[PDB]
């Protein structure tokens, strides 16, 4: 799993080395950001079913043709499965804020997803139009902290660059 | 990384040759168990001796009791494993 602790003890194991002073300096940076990247994950646990309900009904605002037959969401059980695959990502954005790295994003929600979304004829560019709706609707000075904004928006921007 | 503990393609030879001295020993077991049942009921008429069930559909109840009483022969200690080998040989 990609974290900030798993890098410095796999780089120590690969050279056969004890954990020296530069490794323990990097754990000290995990204590600094843990007041912001953990506080944003606390906000994305109870208000999660109102940002996932802001996104997908404005995903269909720019993408009107996905309610047409022959495209993806032509019946109601697929739109309710379209609201599942964004609750599957905001649960994974919530996990990688907690562990610090990009581990739950890249090895669960990203790996393999180029080939399922190719074969099953789902457009990736409506996920990009829906994850980025949670970016610009997010403002800092009412909802969350200052450095909780720049950690949450940097993790929405990671899988935007992975899906594109 | 040295010292021939590290090896490959004999490593898949040994997992596909320890079974060849094992599942060609249960072909010995499945057809020497059959050998004395070819003298117990040696014709189509069954004996008084070969009765499993008497009542109640209790043949399933012993089938639940046969397959987990011989599960408890491989579920045995290595001191109890070697007692089953050096002294059942001497009875044979």
């Amino acid at each position: 799993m990609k974290s900030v602790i798993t890098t410095v003890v796999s780089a120590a194991d690969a050279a056969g080395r004890f954990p020296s002073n530069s490794d323990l300096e990097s754990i000290q940076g995990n204590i600094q950001r843990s007041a912001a990247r953990l506080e944003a994950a606390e906000k994305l646990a109870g208000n999660h079913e109102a940002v996932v309900k802001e996104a997908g009904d404005a995903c269909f605002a720019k993408y009107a043709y996905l309610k047409n037959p022959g495209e993806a969401g032509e019946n109601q059980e697929k739109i309710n499965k379209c609201y599942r695959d964004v609750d599957h990502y905001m649960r994974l954005v919530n996990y990688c804020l907690v562990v610090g790295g990009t581990g739950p994003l890249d090895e669960w929600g990203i790996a393999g997803a180029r080939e399922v979304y190719r074969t099953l004829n789902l457009p990736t560019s409506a996920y990009v139009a829906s994850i980025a709706y949670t970016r610009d609707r997010l403002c800092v000075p009412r909802d969350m902290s200052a450095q909780a904004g720049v950690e949450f928006s940097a993790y929405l921007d990671y899988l935007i660059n992975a899906l594109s | 990384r040295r010292t021939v503990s590290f090896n490959a393609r004999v490593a898949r030879n040994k997992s596909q040759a320890k079974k060849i001295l094992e599942k060609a020993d249960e072909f010995f077991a499945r057809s020497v168990t059959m050998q004395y049942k070819a003298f117990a009921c040696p014709n189509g008429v069954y004996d008084i001796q070969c009765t499993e069930g008497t009542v109640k559909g209790a043949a399933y109840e012993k089938r639940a009791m046969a397959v987990s009483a011989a599960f408890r022969a491989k579920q045995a200690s290595p001191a109890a494993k070697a007692r089953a080998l050096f002294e059942n040989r001497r009875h044979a």
Binding site: S3, D13, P19, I27, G46, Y95, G100 | -
Partner: protein, 177 residues
């Protein structure tokens, strides 16, 4: 290869739970003693070449037939390999103490170690002792109650972290048994 932040999320993907306010108190009690953990890791790795060499030589003086002809630490080639082995075990427990999770020790070091020693004839009755020597020497260097090398610390309580690195030496001595 999971650390202690990556244990609470792999207990929560089974429920597909949004990790919120319940289990985040257990990780805020990780970064409270984070500098207490970093002060504890540094004390082992500063004494690590002495911790191994006192342990392996104490195994000889508690079991003097190991250096008889036919013994397992008899010749110079064998004596260097046991010192090599205990320097790997003390390295992998110190990886586990820094991460706070035994999943760096059990996979990279303990997977297949029991079958290797019986294939090489390495006796486990002496290696349960020589692992348990440096188990007791590790809690001296954490709780500052060693006879020599009183290291400089800050005044508080570290007897939870000394017992937590005792449990990683219980994961060693279970697996090589």
């Amino acid at each position: 290869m999971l650390d202690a932040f990556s244990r609470v999320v792999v207990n929560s993907d089974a429920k597909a739970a949004y990790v919120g306010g319940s289990d985040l108190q257990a990780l805020k009690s990780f970064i409270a003693d984070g500098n207490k953990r970093l002060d504890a890791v540094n004390s082992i790795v500063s004494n690590a070449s002495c911790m191994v060499s006192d342990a392996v030589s104490g195994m000889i003086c508690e079991n003097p037939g190991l250096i008889s002809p036919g013994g397992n630490c008899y010749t110079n080639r064998r004596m260097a390999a046991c010192l090599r082995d205990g320097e790997i075990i003390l390295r992998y427990v110190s990886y586990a103490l820094l991460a706070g999770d035994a999943s760096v020790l059990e996979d990279r070091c303990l997977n297949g170690l029991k079958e290797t020693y019986i294939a090489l004839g390495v006796p486990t009755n002496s290696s349960i002792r020589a692992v348990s020597i440096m188990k007791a020497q590790a809690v001296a260097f954490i709780t500052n109650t060693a006879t020599e090398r009183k290291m400089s610390f800050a005044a508080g309580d570290c007897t939870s972290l000394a017992s937590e690195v005792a449990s990683y030496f219980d994961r060693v001595g279970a697996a090589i048994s």
